[PDB]
Amino acid sequence: MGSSEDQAYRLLNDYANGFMVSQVLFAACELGVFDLLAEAPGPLDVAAVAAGVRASAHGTELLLDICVSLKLLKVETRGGKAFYRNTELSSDYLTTVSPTSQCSMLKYMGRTSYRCWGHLADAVREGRNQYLETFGVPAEELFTAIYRSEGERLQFMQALQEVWSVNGRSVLTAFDLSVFPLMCDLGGGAGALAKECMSLYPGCKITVFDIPEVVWTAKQHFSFEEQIDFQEGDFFKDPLPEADLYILARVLHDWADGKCSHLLERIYHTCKPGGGILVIESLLDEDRRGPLLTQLYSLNMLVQTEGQERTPTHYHMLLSSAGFRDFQFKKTGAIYDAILARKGT
Amino acid sequence: MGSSEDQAYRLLNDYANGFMVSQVLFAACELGVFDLLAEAPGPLDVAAVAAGVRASAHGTELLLDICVSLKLLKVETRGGKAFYRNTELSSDYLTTVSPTSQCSMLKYMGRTSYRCWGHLADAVREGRNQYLETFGVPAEELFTAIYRSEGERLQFMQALQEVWSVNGRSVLTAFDLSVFPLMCDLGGGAGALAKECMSLYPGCKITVFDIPEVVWTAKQHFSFEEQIDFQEGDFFKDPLPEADLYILARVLHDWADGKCSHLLERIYHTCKPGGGILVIESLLDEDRRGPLLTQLYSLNMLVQTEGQERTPTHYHMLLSSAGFRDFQFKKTGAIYDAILARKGT
Ligand SMILES: C[S@@+](CC[C@H](N)C(=O)[O-])C[C@H]1O[C@@H](n2cnc3c(N)ncnc32)[C@H](O)[C@@H]1O
Ligand SMILES: C[S@@+](CC[C@H](N)C(=O)[O-])C[C@H]1O[C@@H](n2cnc3c(N)ncnc32)[C@H](O)[C@@H]1O
Ligand SMILES: [Zn+2]
Ligand SMILES: [Zn+2]
Ligand SMILES: [Zn+2]
Ligand SMILES: [Zn+2]
């Protein structure tokens, strides 16, 4: 709030205004402000940004000035004009060329999640997702609602690959996976995690398993290399590729316990002695009261998917019931953690 | 982000997730969580909250647990159950009975502003408001779009009165207004600021001026006391009530310079020597690069109204052109500041 107001009032305003700060970041990403600034020979003024993003003078200045206050951009003065430049933050996470780019996820959060979240009170009220109430699109089959169009499936796929450029190494190296020569990424999407897995484990080979529409899009928009293979199908009913390790990264959180149990059971019966299951999810503290970002993510699963985020013990009951033993989890200090369980005799 | 990740990545996530934190606060307000907790004989468990707000168990727990992490609620343990209670923050700003309640504004930000803000990129792109693109409602006359229904006009009116319970005293006491026995609050709405003005200045009398629909709603939903009068009309063309002081609180920011100049001109020609104009707005720093909340508010005017937030110098050019002299402003340390100018001979 105001600089002299009581701390509780300032906090309440921070929370109330949060949606505005999210949209400033999302719109700056959608307009390509950071890309234009990274492609420029040096820093740019309002009129040069407004012209490059094809937007209004007043609108651009408001946007750039808010970005400076938020520490997403730096400003400098030359003559009778402000000149904007990228920060370490925006160069690393907000430019398309950066390997650690978070662009596509931000644009996705802005275009889909933000819309869904307006219906939060009803998702809480009813205990169910709101794709029909938000997009008019039936969600009886979760992913036909999520991939409501070709361009929307490419965007989802581009969005999801982005976290692995920052979190990939932590999760794949939490446990020594060199022990599993043949791997399968169930619901592997574009294959970003698999690409990382193969550079990390030179001996290993991996199959990316996903629905026919994702596999086709992955091959059409992402190039590959000699360690990675693709199998298309439905993990709830099709035969799974033979593997020593099955990886489930952000798959279990999309579904309720019963659906999770079914998939875990199929994987278990497909595994051989010494076989493993690597579950990659954001772990909830045992009291379900943190971390805050994970709690928000669990609420985002209520609003969007059929699932929730879970505690280590919850993933343990699920994996133990499916038949797995030697349950171990590793808290990475990152958004995504790793769980590994094995099949015995 | 994750507790061990780089500070820039944690900051980017804070910003990206802001919309979720806003909606948690808005939905907790819409569900009446804080009221139910204040009306209870003591602290309540998940099942008692879920039943009282008529919502799902999973949804309620997620909501309450996020509120605890956000410091909006406190939790305690008794037997095999968590018990939630209000904080100083929620009791003072989030309960309907509290005089400093911010409820109605939060519900309004959630229901209208949040929706509008999804169209931020286009409001920036085009340099205009999005009522037609968001609500289907024509905005050619700003307030017919803002008061699109009776219940929506009552909500807007209830929302706007709330800031004056906290910021009212600062703005009205920045300058000694005892010098102006007769006052007029132009666009005074429900008359919250006028009610405060009259307790602060016992000698003074005030007329609340607003559009016929607002005046009728104000008399029908708010009771009055012997110092306050109501005149209905259009400040752009109707005769203004006779007054020594004209107050413009959050009126100028809704409009562009030309519309502001027109209204200021009418007020000037209505004033007599020694007459005053009290402008109450959130002042932008001279470089237009802060405060952050004011910059967000200026962007909210681009997205919603026909105006912007302005710098002291900008309000000075406007007031000076209309004919006013002795321009003075006072930065309160709060969201809203005060500007006073006078009419000479
Ligand atoms: C939330 S995405 C996670 C993708 C990826 N593992 C990551 O973390 O970036 C869940 C993935 O599961 C895939 N999926 C959903 N249902 C499936 C099914 N029945 N059979 C195969 N793949 C499925 C989706 O198409 C999607 O790529
Ligand atoms: C943004 S509200 C501010 C209300 C109040 N002064 C406050 O700060 O809480 C602007 C007020 O101006 C009123 N208004 C808009 N156009 C008007 C007009 N042409 N004549 C009279 N009142 C008008 C609106 O109905 C509304 O109550
Ligand atoms: Zn079995
Ligand atoms: Zn168990
Ligand atoms: Zn004149
Ligand atoms: Zn001037």
> Hey, which residues 13-52 in chain B have their CB within 8 Å of chain A?
13, 15-27, 30-31
Residues of B in contact with A58 (CB under 8 A): 127, 302, 308
Identify the CA nearest to B13 among candidates A335, A182, A209, A6.
A335
A226: which 2 tokens? Answer: 């000699």
- Three-state DSSP at A156 gives helix
Identify the CA nearest to A267 among candidates B315, B286, A275.
A275
Q: How was this structure determined?
A: X-ray
- Alpha carbon distance B225, B124 (integer Å): 44
Gap from CA of B209 to ligand 6 centroid (Å)? 29
- Alpha carbon distance B262, B233 (integer Å): 16
Residue nearest to atom 3 of ligand 1 (CA): A250
Q: Is A85 exposed, middle or buried (0-12, 13-18, 19+ CB in 10 A)?
A: middle
- Whose atoms come closest to the Cα of A257: which ligand? 4
- Alpha carbon distance A310, A319 (integer Å): 12
Alpha helices for B174-275 (secondary structure H): 192-200, 212-221, 257-270
Residues of A in contact with B22 (CB under 8 A): 15-19, 22
User: Helices A7-31 and B7-31 sit at what angle, rounded to 10 degrees?
Assistant: 110
Catalytic pick among B119, B221, B253, B269? B253
**Cis before B41? omega within 30:** no
CA dihedral B305, A66, B167, B278 (to 10 degrees): -60
Q: What is the residue type of B104?
A: S
- Alpha carbon distance B66, A137 (integer Å): 29
Q: What is the residue type of B174?
A: A
- Alpha carbon distance B183, B172 (integer Å): 12
Residue nearest to atom 22 of ligand 2 (CA): B210
Q: Resolution in Å, one decimal, please.
A: 2.4
| Domain span(s) for CATH 1.10.10.10 in chain B | 1-94
Alpha helices for chain B (secondary structure H): 7-31, 33-39, 46-53, 57-69, 88-93, 103-108, 114-117, 120-126, 131-135, 142-146, 150-161, 164-173, 192-200, 212-221, 257-270, 292-303, 312-322
Domain B95-345, architecture per CATH: 3-Layer(aba) Sandwich (3.40)
Burial B33-48 (b: 16+ CB within 10 A, else e): bbbbbbeeeebbbbeb
Q: If one looks up domain A1-94 in CATH, what number appears?
A: 1.10.10.10
> Which residues, 6+ apart, have CB-to-CB distance to B288 below 8 Å?
A61, A65, B295, B311
> Residue B275: beta bridge partners?
none
Phi first, then psi, for residue A84 (nearest 5°) are -100, 145
